[PDB]
Amino acid sequence: LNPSARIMTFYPTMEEFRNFSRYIAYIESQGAHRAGLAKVVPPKEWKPRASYDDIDDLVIPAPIQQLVTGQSGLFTQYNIQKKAMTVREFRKIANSDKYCTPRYSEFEELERKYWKNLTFNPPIYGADVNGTLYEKHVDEWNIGRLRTILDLVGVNTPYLYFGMWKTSFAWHTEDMDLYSINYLHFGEPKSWYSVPPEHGKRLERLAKGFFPGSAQSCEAFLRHKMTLISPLMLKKYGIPFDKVTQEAGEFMITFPYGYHAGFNHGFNCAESTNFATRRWIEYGKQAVLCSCMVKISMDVFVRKFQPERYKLWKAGKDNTVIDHTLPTPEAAEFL
């Protein structure tokens, strides 16, 4: 049951792939959740949209210029909101000489170039664009309507991310320690780093040691999604982690309390949203939030799935310690 907590890759058939929540339960029974990140390669015959040639006049309302400050594997990213631009304007800029991906042999070479140049030539990230690239009829893994227990509740809505070389997402867990689904619609790859949920507190303690002013101001400062930490720093301080490259037409699943970060190799488009399973309810209850934020009332969840614990929890007498290695109750039919 994944004792090494390494990122697992799944290749479901069309029949396996049809039920989203059932397949999430299956990958959990195989211990995929232990790494905090997993890859799901869909069947070759599956496509969420016939063509991506009609999106040139799609508006990115808040492009963000990403300014990075730091040294020795420790960085802070500052976002500068720019005025609205089209995918056409973004793609041209992305592919221009100033912002294009450098020439490289292996990923290790591109990764080294990223960590060496992330403070130079700030890129533009077409992030958090409300919308979907999923066609209407597509019933399998539709990020716009996954129909998880999360529907009981801008947390169940899809977001589009138009990336360019060196655009980054900082170290973070999902808001409310939820799950997330990320599908790379098209383009250049997206490379990820993950810290297993069982070592999430080790990363937080390391981050608190390096940014003590940021931690004294906010309890969960990593939730601001500004802190970038290189694989070499993680290695230097014995933080266990793994890395994976997501290619066009592949899904990435993030698990409750699974810390992740990464960067885009070049012009690309990803679709994302949050989702839940019965396992998340305890993570939602115990989630340490940003003081200075996305907040969900957990009462409705405890009232339906834990009616016996509702009174105890409403009082403060529910002090259940989470086991990060345990799979979702739904994973019963696969064990």
Ligand X SMILES: CN(C)CCc1cccc(C2CCN(CCc3cnn(-c4nccc5c(=O)[nH]cnc45)c3)CC2)c1
Report the C-alpha gap between 37 and 215 in whole angstroms. 26
Considering the complex, state which of residue 190 and residue 279 has its C-beta at the smaller distance from ligand X.
Answer: 190
Tell me whether residue 4 is one of the annotated catalytic residues: no
Of 96, 104, 77, 85, residue with least CA distance to 169 = 77
- The helix (H) or strand (E) run that includes residue 14 is helix 14-17
Q: Which of 291, 303, 311, 329 binds Zn ion (CB under 5 A)?
A: 291
In degrees rounded to 5, what are phi and psi of residue 49?
-160, 135
Helix/strand/coil for 84: coil
Considering the complex, state which of residue 250 and residue 330 has its C-beta at the smaller distance from ligand X.
Answer: 250
- Per CB under 6 A, does 154 bind ligand X? yes
- Per CB under 6 A, does 128 bind ligand X? yes
Q: Which of 66, 142, 148, 182 binds ligand X (CB under 6 A)?
A: 182
Q: Which of 10, 20, 141, 169 binds ligand X (CB under 6 A)?
A: 169
Residue type, position 198, single letter: E
Site string for ligand X, 251-290 (x = CB under 6 A): ---------x---------x--------------------
**Both tokens assigned to 173:** 């867990």
The residue from 28, 114, 134, 174 that is catalytic is: 174
Tell me whether residue 260 is one of the annotated catalytic residues: yes
Helix/strand/coil for 16: helix
**Both tokens assigned to 10:** 């799944």
The residue from 72, 96, 104, 154 that is catalytic is: 154
Which does residue 61 touch among Zn ion, ligand X, none (CB within 5 to 8 A, set by kind)? none
The residue from 26, 99, 161, 193 that is catalytic is: 161
Report the C-alpha gap between 181 and 159 in whole angstroms. 11
Binding annotation: 125, 172, 174, 182, 190, 218, 224-225, 260, 290, 292
The residue from 33, 185, 260, 324 that is catalytic is: 260
Stretch that binds Zn ion, among 14-22, 96-104, 105-113, 284-292 (CB under 5 A): 284-292
Considering the complex, state which of residue 110 and residue 270 has its C-beta at the smaller distance from ligand X.
Answer: 270
Considering the complex, state which of residue 61 and residue 329 has its C-beta at the smaller distance from ligand X.
Answer: 61
Of 163, 201, 196, 204, residue with least CA distance to 182 = 163
* In the complex, minimum distance from the CB of residue 173 to ligand X, in angstroms, rounded to a whole number: 8
Q: Is 218 left (phi over 0), alpha (psi -120 to 50) or beta?
A: beta
**By the 8 A CB rule, do 8 and 39 touch?**
yes
Report the C-alpha gap between 85 and 59 in whole angstroms. 6
- Active-site positions read 154, 161, 172, 174, 260, 272
